[PDB]
Amino acid sequence: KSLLQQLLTE
Amino acid sequence: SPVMVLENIEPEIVYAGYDSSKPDTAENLLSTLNRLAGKQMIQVVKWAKVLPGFKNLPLEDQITLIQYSWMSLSSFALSWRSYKHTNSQFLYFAPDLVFNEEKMHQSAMYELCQGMHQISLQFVRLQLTFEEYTIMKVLLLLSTIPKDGLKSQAAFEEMRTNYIKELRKMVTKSSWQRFYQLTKLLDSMHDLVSDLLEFCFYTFRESHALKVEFPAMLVEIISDQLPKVESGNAKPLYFHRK
Ligand SMILES: NS(=O)(=O)C[C@H]1COc2cc(F)ccc2N1C(=O)c1ccc2c(c1)NC(=O)CO2
């Protein structure tokens, strides 16, 4: 997962 | 009231972490701006997750919108801080980083800085309200899409249409004339953002040659966005075609 994906899904 | 939610979800302002003891070189100033942009990008994600309607869009579309609009949201907020805190006399990047003529020159972005100052001067002319500002910032998040459209284009269009309706309802408080002045201002953002991105892509591609540092968040976003913008995959959405 990208940093953006990680932040949006947490 | 979705606009009252917007006012309440506005992020805390961020410090630049600007080191005024270090030489005010273009490398040092631009590296500070990039560190600032990275911190702002974390705030954009936290804000977008709680933005009414945003959760309805699929994850791929949420990522696309954030990556395509980052410079638009960032430059529009810089204009807001400049207007609110200095009456648009200076560029208020952060409480600890306010640009005067000296810093505009040192940054090696003088002309882009004057272009940004011109937008903040429009906020004064129009006497832009915080309510108008918050709706317009959502419209900027929804102002650039892929040329072949999003994964859930109809869901996006419903959200965008709804926020346009909110802006029209809001201008009655300060009305058709005001609506068109606000949509003209929103459209004008695309041209300034294009020029800001052109310089950002240049310093990104010739980074260590120019000693300009980028945080991980910016590296990731720009690496994805840069080939898409340059190949003509980005589609700016205009209220009024130029
Ligand atoms: N994050 S912020 O500093 O508070 C506001 C944003 C968006 O509006 C701006 C307007 C300006 F006149 C100057 C900088 C920025 N901003 C930039 O992030 C940015 C733009 C281009 C770049 C760079 C930064 N960085 C580079 O290396 C060179 O290209």
Short mmCIF file of C-alpha atoms and ligand atoms in Angstrom, two decimals:
data_model
loop_
_atom_site.label_atom_id
_atom_site.label_comp_id
_atom_site.label_asym_id
_atom_site.label_seq_id
_atom_site.Cartn_x
_atom_site.Cartn_y
_atom_site.Cartn_z
CA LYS A 1 0.00 0.00 0.00
CA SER A 2 1.10 3.60 -0.82
CA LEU A 3 1.20 6.31 1.94
CA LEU A 4 -1.98 7.84 0.46
CA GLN A 5 -3.77 4.39 0.39
CA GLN A 6 -2.59 3.72 4.02
CA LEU A 7 -3.95 7.11 5.26
CA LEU A 8 -7.31 6.83 3.43
CA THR A 9 -8.00 3.26 4.71
CA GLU A 10 -6.86 3.62 8.39
CA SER B 1 -26.18 21.99 7.15
CA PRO B 2 -23.17 20.69 5.11
CA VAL B 3 -21.50 24.14 5.07
CA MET B 4 -21.52 24.22 8.91
CA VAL B 5 -19.77 20.80 8.83
CA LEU B 6 -17.17 22.37 6.39
CA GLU B 7 -16.45 25.27 8.79
CA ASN B 8 -15.94 22.78 11.66
CA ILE B 9 -13.68 20.33 9.78
CA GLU B 10 -11.22 23.01 8.69
CA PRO B 11 -7.72 21.81 9.74
CA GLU B 12 -5.45 23.50 12.33
CA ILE B 13 -2.87 25.77 10.64
CA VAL B 14 0.65 24.12 10.33
CA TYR B 15 4.08 25.59 11.06
CA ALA B 16 6.68 25.54 8.25
CA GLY B 17 9.62 24.67 10.56
CA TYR B 18 11.53 27.43 8.78
CA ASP B 19 15.14 27.87 10.02
CA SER B 20 15.89 31.60 9.78
CA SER B 21 19.50 30.95 10.99
CA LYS B 22 20.31 28.95 7.79
CA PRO B 23 21.08 30.93 4.55
CA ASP B 24 17.95 32.01 2.66
CA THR B 25 18.91 30.17 -0.52
CA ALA B 26 16.34 28.91 -3.06
CA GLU B 27 17.30 25.30 -1.97
CA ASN B 28 16.51 26.02 1.71
CA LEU B 29 13.26 27.99 1.08
CA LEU B 30 11.84 25.51 -1.47
CA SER B 31 12.79 22.54 0.82
CA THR B 32 10.83 24.30 3.64
CA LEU B 33 7.82 24.81 1.30
CA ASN B 34 7.93 21.10 0.34
CA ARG B 35 8.08 20.01 4.07
CA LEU B 36 5.07 22.36 4.59
CA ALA B 37 3.21 20.84 1.52
CA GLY B 38 3.79 17.32 2.93
CA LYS B 39 2.30 18.25 6.35
CA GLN B 40 -0.66 19.96 4.55
CA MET B 41 -1.23 16.80 2.48
CA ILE B 42 -1.75 14.72 5.67
CA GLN B 43 -4.34 17.35 6.75
CA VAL B 44 -6.06 17.14 3.28
CA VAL B 45 -6.48 13.34 3.75
CA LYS B 46 -7.92 13.74 7.32
CA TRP B 47 -10.28 16.49 6.04
CA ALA B 48 -11.36 14.59 2.88
CA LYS B 49 -12.26 11.43 4.90
CA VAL B 50 -14.84 13.45 6.94
CA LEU B 51 -16.00 15.61 3.99
CA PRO B 52 -19.77 14.91 3.40
CA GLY B 53 -20.13 12.67 0.33
CA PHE B 54 -16.40 11.83 -0.08
CA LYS B 55 -16.72 8.39 1.55
CA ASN B 56 -19.23 7.38 -1.22
CA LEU B 57 -16.47 7.59 -3.87
CA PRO B 58 -14.35 4.40 -4.39
CA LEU B 59 -10.78 4.39 -2.97
CA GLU B 60 -9.16 4.65 -6.47
CA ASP B 61 -11.21 7.82 -7.20
CA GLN B 62 -10.44 9.34 -3.76
CA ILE B 63 -6.69 8.88 -4.45
CA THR B 64 -7.06 10.31 -8.00
CA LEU B 65 -8.87 13.48 -6.77
CA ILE B 66 -6.38 14.13 -3.93
CA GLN B 67 -3.36 13.61 -6.28
CA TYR B 68 -4.81 15.80 -9.06
CA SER B 69 -6.02 18.64 -6.77
CA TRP B 70 -3.20 18.90 -4.15
CA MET B 71 -1.67 22.12 -5.66
CA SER B 72 -5.17 23.64 -6.19
CA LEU B 73 -6.24 23.06 -2.54
CA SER B 74 -2.83 24.20 -1.27
CA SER B 75 -2.66 27.39 -3.35
CA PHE B 76 -6.28 28.31 -2.56
CA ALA B 77 -5.60 27.89 1.20
CA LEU B 78 -2.42 29.98 0.93
CA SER B 79 -4.56 32.74 -0.66
CA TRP B 80 -7.05 32.39 2.28
CA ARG B 81 -4.31 32.66 4.98
CA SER B 82 -2.77 35.68 3.13
CA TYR B 83 -6.18 37.37 3.05
CA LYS B 84 -7.26 36.51 6.64
CA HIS B 85 -3.96 37.24 8.43
CA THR B 86 -2.38 40.10 6.37
CA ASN B 87 -5.31 41.54 4.27
CA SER B 88 -3.42 40.02 1.27
CA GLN B 89 -0.40 42.33 1.78
CA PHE B 90 1.93 39.28 2.14
CA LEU B 91 1.99 35.54 1.34
CA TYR B 92 1.16 33.83 4.70
CA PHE B 93 2.67 30.36 4.09
CA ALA B 94 2.65 29.67 7.86
CA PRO B 95 2.79 31.70 11.17
CA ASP B 96 6.62 31.18 11.07
CA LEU B 97 6.93 31.85 7.28
CA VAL B 98 5.47 35.04 5.79
CA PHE B 99 6.96 36.14 2.46
CA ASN B 100 8.03 39.73 1.82
CA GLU B 101 9.63 40.86 -1.53
CA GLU B 102 13.00 39.44 -0.33
CA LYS B 103 11.65 35.89 0.16
CA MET B 104 9.68 35.98 -3.14
CA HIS B 105 13.01 36.69 -4.94
CA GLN B 106 15.10 34.23 -2.83
CA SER B 107 12.60 31.38 -3.45
CA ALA B 108 13.41 31.60 -7.25
CA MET B 109 9.57 31.69 -7.71
CA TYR B 110 9.15 35.50 -7.86
CA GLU B 111 6.67 35.58 -10.80
CA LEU B 112 4.67 32.60 -9.43
CA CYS B 113 4.56 34.36 -6.01
CA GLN B 114 3.15 37.55 -7.68
CA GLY B 115 0.56 35.33 -9.48
CA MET B 116 -0.45 33.91 -6.07
CA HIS B 117 -0.56 37.46 -4.60
CA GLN B 118 -2.99 38.41 -7.47
CA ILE B 119 -5.46 35.67 -6.33
CA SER B 120 -5.27 36.85 -2.67
CA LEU B 121 -5.98 40.41 -3.93
CA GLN B 122 -9.19 39.03 -5.57
CA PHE B 123 -10.28 37.74 -2.11
CA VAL B 124 -10.05 41.36 -0.81
CA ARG B 125 -11.90 42.79 -3.87
CA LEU B 126 -14.76 40.26 -3.50
CA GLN B 127 -14.65 40.33 0.36
CA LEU B 128 -14.70 36.50 0.24
CA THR B 129 -16.42 34.95 3.25
CA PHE B 130 -15.27 31.86 5.16
CA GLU B 131 -18.52 30.07 4.18
CA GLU B 132 -17.86 30.76 0.45
CA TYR B 133 -14.18 29.80 0.85
CA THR B 134 -14.97 26.33 2.40
CA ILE B 135 -17.46 25.44 -0.38
CA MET B 136 -15.02 26.59 -3.09
CA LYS B 137 -12.19 24.49 -1.58
CA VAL B 138 -14.41 21.33 -1.94
CA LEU B 139 -15.09 22.34 -5.56
CA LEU B 140 -11.31 22.51 -6.13
CA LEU B 141 -10.93 18.97 -4.73
CA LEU B 142 -13.46 17.98 -7.46
CA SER B 143 -12.00 20.17 -10.28
CA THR B 144 -9.48 17.82 -12.00
CA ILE B 145 -10.36 14.28 -13.18
CA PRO B 146 -8.78 11.71 -15.62
CA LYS B 147 -9.46 12.39 -19.34
CA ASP B 148 -11.23 8.95 -19.53
CA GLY B 149 -13.24 9.78 -16.36
CA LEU B 150 -13.31 8.29 -12.85
CA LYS B 151 -14.19 4.67 -11.83
CA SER B 152 -17.56 5.95 -10.44
CA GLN B 153 -18.16 9.02 -12.64
CA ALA B 154 -21.89 9.33 -11.75
CA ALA B 155 -21.12 9.26 -7.95
CA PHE B 156 -18.48 12.00 -8.49
CA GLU B 157 -20.85 14.14 -10.63
CA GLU B 158 -23.61 13.88 -7.99
CA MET B 159 -21.18 15.07 -5.26
CA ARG B 160 -19.80 17.94 -7.47
CA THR B 161 -23.37 19.05 -8.52
CA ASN B 162 -24.48 19.07 -4.86
CA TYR B 163 -21.58 21.30 -3.80
CA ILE B 164 -22.25 23.69 -6.78
CA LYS B 165 -25.90 23.90 -5.45
CA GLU B 166 -24.50 24.74 -1.96
CA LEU B 167 -22.36 27.57 -3.42
CA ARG B 168 -25.44 29.01 -5.22
CA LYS B 169 -27.53 28.85 -1.96
CA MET B 170 -24.65 30.54 -0.07
CA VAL B 171 -24.14 33.58 -2.45
CA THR B 172 -27.73 34.78 -1.58
CA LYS B 173 -26.34 35.82 1.90
CA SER B 174 -23.85 38.42 0.46
CA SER B 175 -27.01 37.21 -6.19
CA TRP B 176 -26.34 35.77 -9.73
CA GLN B 177 -23.55 38.40 -10.09
CA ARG B 178 -21.70 37.06 -7.05
CA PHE B 179 -22.11 33.42 -8.20
CA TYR B 180 -20.37 34.18 -11.54
CA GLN B 181 -17.60 36.18 -9.81
CA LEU B 182 -16.92 33.07 -7.63
CA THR B 183 -17.04 30.59 -10.53
CA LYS B 184 -14.73 32.94 -12.57
CA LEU B 185 -12.27 32.94 -9.56
CA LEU B 186 -12.43 29.07 -9.34
CA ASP B 187 -11.70 28.72 -13.10
CA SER B 188 -8.77 31.16 -12.81
CA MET B 189 -7.12 28.69 -10.34
CA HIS B 190 -6.38 26.11 -13.11
CA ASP B 191 -3.96 28.46 -14.99
CA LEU B 192 -1.99 29.46 -11.82
CA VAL B 193 -1.92 25.78 -10.64
CA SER B 194 -0.60 24.67 -14.10
CA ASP B 195 2.33 27.13 -13.75
CA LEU B 196 3.00 26.13 -10.10
CA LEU B 197 3.02 22.42 -11.11
CA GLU B 198 5.33 23.13 -14.09
CA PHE B 199 7.92 24.58 -11.65
CA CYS B 200 7.35 21.82 -9.08
CA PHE B 201 7.85 19.09 -11.75
CA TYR B 202 11.09 20.86 -12.87
CA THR B 203 12.64 21.04 -9.34
CA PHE B 204 11.44 17.42 -8.69
CA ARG B 205 13.16 16.09 -11.87
CA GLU B 206 16.39 18.11 -11.21
CA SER B 207 16.23 17.72 -7.36
CA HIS B 208 19.82 17.08 -6.10
CA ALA B 209 21.21 19.27 -8.98
CA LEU B 210 19.25 22.15 -7.33
CA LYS B 211 19.49 20.66 -3.69
CA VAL B 212 15.66 20.87 -3.30
CA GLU B 213 14.32 18.27 -0.82
CA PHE B 214 10.91 16.53 -1.03
CA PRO B 215 9.16 14.61 1.81
CA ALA B 216 7.96 10.99 1.13
CA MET B 217 4.27 12.10 0.80
CA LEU B 218 5.24 14.57 -2.01
CA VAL B 219 7.60 12.08 -3.72
CA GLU B 220 4.78 9.52 -3.97
CA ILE B 221 2.11 11.98 -5.18
CA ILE B 222 4.37 13.78 -7.74
CA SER B 223 5.82 10.45 -9.09
CA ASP B 224 2.23 9.34 -9.95
CA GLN B 225 0.84 12.78 -10.98
CA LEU B 226 3.82 14.10 -13.14
CA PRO B 227 3.60 11.47 -16.04
CA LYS B 228 -0.25 11.77 -16.01
CA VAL B 229 -0.26 15.63 -16.22
CA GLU B 230 2.52 15.71 -18.91
CA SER B 231 0.84 12.98 -21.06
CA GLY B 232 -2.42 15.02 -21.07
CA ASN B 233 -4.36 12.54 -18.87
CA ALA B 234 -5.45 15.33 -16.48
CA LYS B 235 -8.73 17.01 -17.37
CA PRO B 236 -9.36 20.39 -15.65
CA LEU B 237 -13.13 21.00 -15.18
CA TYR B 238 -14.18 24.57 -15.96
CA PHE B 239 -17.46 26.26 -15.06
CA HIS B 240 -16.97 28.50 -18.14
CA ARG B 241 -14.87 27.19 -21.03
CA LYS B 242 -12.19 29.77 -22.03
N1 LIG C 1 2.45 24.21 0.53
S1 LIG C 1 2.60 25.90 0.52
O1 LIG C 1 3.94 26.28 0.14
O2 LIG C 1 1.96 26.38 1.74
C1 LIG C 1 1.48 26.35 -0.79
C2 LIG C 1 1.78 25.67 -2.12
C3 LIG C 1 0.74 26.02 -3.16
O3 LIG C 1 0.80 27.41 -3.53
C4 LIG C 1 2.10 27.91 -3.67
C5 LIG C 1 2.20 29.17 -4.23
C6 LIG C 1 3.46 29.74 -4.36
F1 LIG C 1 3.57 30.97 -4.90
C7 LIG C 1 4.59 29.07 -3.94
C8 LIG C 1 4.49 27.82 -3.38
C9 LIG C 1 3.24 27.23 -3.25
N2 LIG C 1 3.09 25.94 -2.69
C10 LIG C 1 3.91 24.81 -2.91
O4 LIG C 1 3.83 23.80 -2.22
C11 LIG C 1 4.89 24.72 -4.03
C12 LIG C 1 4.60 25.14 -5.33
C13 LIG C 1 5.54 24.99 -6.33
C14 LIG C 1 6.76 24.40 -6.02
C15 LIG C 1 7.04 23.98 -4.74
C16 LIG C 1 6.11 24.14 -3.73
N3 LIG C 1 8.27 23.35 -4.46
C17 LIG C 1 9.30 23.37 -5.35
O5 LIG C 1 10.32 22.70 -5.24
C18 LIG C 1 9.07 24.34 -6.48
O6 LIG C 1 7.72 24.23 -7.02
#
